């Protein structure tokens, strides 16, 4: 029900950074810098600007002290300065609230447009950014769990096909999705930069931010993050994983920051840059779709996500999903999942895999 505008879409390069509001800046710094080893581009009493090992733009993450923890903006870099004008014209045509700042909303970004998008999400588009020392060969700084790139965002939204269509018009190409035999869509992944995704839609009450994902070079780097969290005795902040994804084929881990913002660590998905890249649809009941090894998806993964803010700094109202619930149809009392389609052996009914029930 979101029409394709006459105005041309801005040419989006990739996800570039997220601005997260955090309640205790010191505790957040402890998590992102001391635990996760992100690199400080700038900090003061209000904000911490962080980047990954291979990044040359000013930052991939802004942490902003605020009264209520929430996503403040998810930023995409566009190809040219003129693409910021294109973004403004596009979202104006859609009837969305927009705000333009010629000198940026955060440090290290220039001319930028923020919008309350049709799904209620605060998107930023920008070209101009302050270049910093690209640390990609600074092996004197490299940590055993080094986060090397920002990879993607993931958004919770009640109507997946509605948001998918909107993002396709915006230029994202769908790479994978999860549906059932009766035509319900539960999740979709879509890209600009030639990886599996730059953002993704998870069916649920929204708008809420599901997670922000960073890449490592190798699988052992993700293992080290888990190991380090056990050593720091904060294993209760490991939410889910580590595992191999079905959708995306990436090795992964989900952890929780001090304000319960979910962060994914991700590596080794595949190239999607060709225009006829084959799309892959998984059945919702396929127990290898989210964790390839069949490990159960923790219930909080389906229920918990971050608030998002409007352009005034206020929390967006949550709209309830009316389509079927992935949690309910797979691990709920009347849910089921299979290892091999049509096989009772290795299937789970009314509970999760590996012998667990929902707590």
181 marked as part of a ligand binding site: yes
> Smaller CB distance to Cl ion: residue 60 or 287?
287
Q: Which residue has the tokens 């290892």?
A: 339
Contacts of 212 (CB under 8 A, 6+ apart): 18, 20, 61, 150, 152, 153, 154, 261, 262, 263, 264
The stretch among 20-28, 130-138, 215-223, 283-291 that binds Cl ion (CB under 5 A) is 283-291
218 marked as part of a ligand binding site: no
> Smaller CB distance to Cl ion: residue 121 or 189?
189
> Smaller CB distance to Mn ion: residue 116 or 264?
264
- Give the phi and the psi of residue 184 in degrees, each rounded to 5: -85, 135
Residues 295-354 that bind a second copy (CB under 8 A): 295-296, 298-300, 339-340, 345-346, 348, 351-354
Angle CA 267–269–273, to nearest 5: 135
* Residue 182 touching Ca ion (CB under 5 A): yes
Find the DSSP H helices in 170-242: 219-231
The site partner of 313 among Mn ion, Ca ion, a second copy, none (C-beta below 5 to 8 Å per kind) is none
Residue choice 13, 33, 315, 319 for contact with a second copy (CB under 8 A) = 13
317 marked as part of a ligand binding site: no
Residue choice 77, 152, 192, 290 for contact with Cl ion (CB under 5 A) = 290
Q: Of all helices (H) and strands (E), which one includes residue 56?
A: none
Give residues in contact with Mn ion (CB under 5 A).
154, 213, 264
The site partner of 290 among Cl ion, Ca ion, Mn ion, none (C-beta below 5 to 8 Å per kind) is Cl ion
39 marked as part of a ligand binding site: no
* Structure tokens that stand for 71 in this block: 């996503």
108 three-class SS: coil
> Smaller CB distance to Cl ion: residue 98 or 154?
154
Q: Which residue has the tokens 């070079």?
A: 217
Going by C-alpha positions, the residue among 205, 230, 218, 184 that lies closest to residue 324 is: 184
* Residue 278 touching a second copy (CB under 8 A): yes
In angstroms, the CA 36 to CA 55 distance is: 16
211 marked as part of a ligand binding site: yes
CB atoms closer than 10 angstroms to residue 240: 21
> Smaller CB distance to Ca ion: residue 30 or 179?
179
Going by C-alpha positions, the residue among 317, 330, 338, 337 that lies closest to residue 358 is: 330
Residue choice 181, 236, 320, 343 for contact with Ca ion (CB under 5 A) = 181
* Structure tokens that stand for 268 in this block: 């080794």
The answer to whether 115 and 91 are in contact (CB under 8 A) is yes
In angstroms, the CA 85 to CA 18 distance is: 21
In angstroms, the CA 28 to CA 36 distance is: 11
The site partner of 264 among Ca ion, Mn ion, a second copy, none (C-beta below 5 to 8 Å per kind) is Mn ion
The site partner of 181 among Ca ion, a second copy, Cl ion, none (C-beta below 5 to 8 Å per kind) is Ca ion
> Smaller CB distance to a second copy: residue 183 or 275?
275
Least Å from the CB of residue 54 to a second copy: 5
Least Å from the CB of residue 157 to Ca ion: 22
> Smaller CB distance to Mn ion: residue 167 or 213?
213
For a second copy, what does the binding mask look like between residues 34 and 63, x meaning CB under 8 A? Answer: --------------------x-xx------
- 301 burial via Cβ count (<10 Å: 0-12, 13-18, 19+): buried
The answer to whether 265 and 224 are in contact (CB under 8 A) is no
The stretch among 52-60, 61-69, 127-135, 282-290 that binds Cl ion (CB under 5 A) is 282-290
Q: Which residue has the tokens 């939204």?
A: 157
> Smaller CB distance to a second copy: residue 149 or 211?
149
Residue choice 169, 224, 310, 336 for contact with a second copy (CB under 8 A) = 224
Least Å from the CB of residue 51 to a second copy: 13
Residue numbers in the known binding site for Fe(3+) are 152, 211, 264
Residues of this chain that interact with Cl ion (CB under 5 A) are: 290
């Amino acid at each position: 029900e979101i029409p394709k505008p006459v105005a041309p879409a801005p040419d989006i390069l990739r996800c570039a950074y997220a601005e997260l509001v955090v309640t205790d800046l010191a505790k957040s710094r402890n998590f992102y810098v001391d635990v996760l080893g992100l690199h400080v581009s700038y900090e003061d009493e209000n904000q911490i600007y962080l980047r990954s090992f291979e990044e040359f733009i000013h930052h991939n993450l802004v942490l902003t002290k605020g009264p209520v923890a929430a996503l403040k903006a998810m930023a995409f870099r566009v190809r040219t300065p003129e693409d910021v004008d294109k973004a403004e014209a596009y979202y104006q045509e859609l009837g969305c609230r927009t705000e333009r700042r010629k000198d940026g909303f955060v440090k290290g970004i220039g001319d930028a447009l923020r919008v309350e998008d049709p799904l209620g999400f605060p998107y930023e588009f920008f070209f101009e950014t302050t270049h910093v020392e690209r640390l990609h060969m600074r092996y004197d700084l490299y940590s055993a769990g080094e986060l090397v790139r920002l990879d993607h965002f993931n958004q919770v939204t009640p109507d997946v096909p509605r948001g998918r269509k909107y993002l396709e018009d915006l230029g994202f190409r769908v790479t994978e999705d999860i549906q059932d035999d009766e035509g319900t869509t539960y999740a979709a992944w879509m890209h600009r930069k030639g990886t599996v995704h730059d953002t993704a839609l998870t069916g649920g009450n929204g708008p809420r931010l599901h997670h922000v994902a960073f890449s490592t070079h190798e699988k052992h780097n993700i293992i080290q993050i888990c190991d380090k969290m056990g050593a720091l005795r904060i294993s209760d902040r490991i939410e889910r994983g580590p595992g191999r994804h079905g959708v995306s084929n990436a090795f992964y881990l989900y952890i929780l920051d001090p304000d319960n913002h979910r962060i994914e660590i991700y590596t080794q998905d595949y190239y999607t840059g060709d225009p006829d890249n084959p799309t892959i649809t998984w059945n919702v009941h396929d127990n290898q779709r989210r964790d390839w090894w069949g490990n159960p998806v923790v219930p909080s993964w389906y229920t918990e996500a971050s608030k998002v803010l409007d352009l005034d700094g206020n929390v967006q109202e949550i709209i309830e999903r009316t389509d079927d619930s992935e949690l309910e149809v797979t691990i709920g009392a009347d849910g089921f999942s299979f290892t091999r389609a049509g096989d009772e052996d290795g299937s789970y009914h009314g509970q999760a895999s590996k012998g667990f029930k929902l707590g």
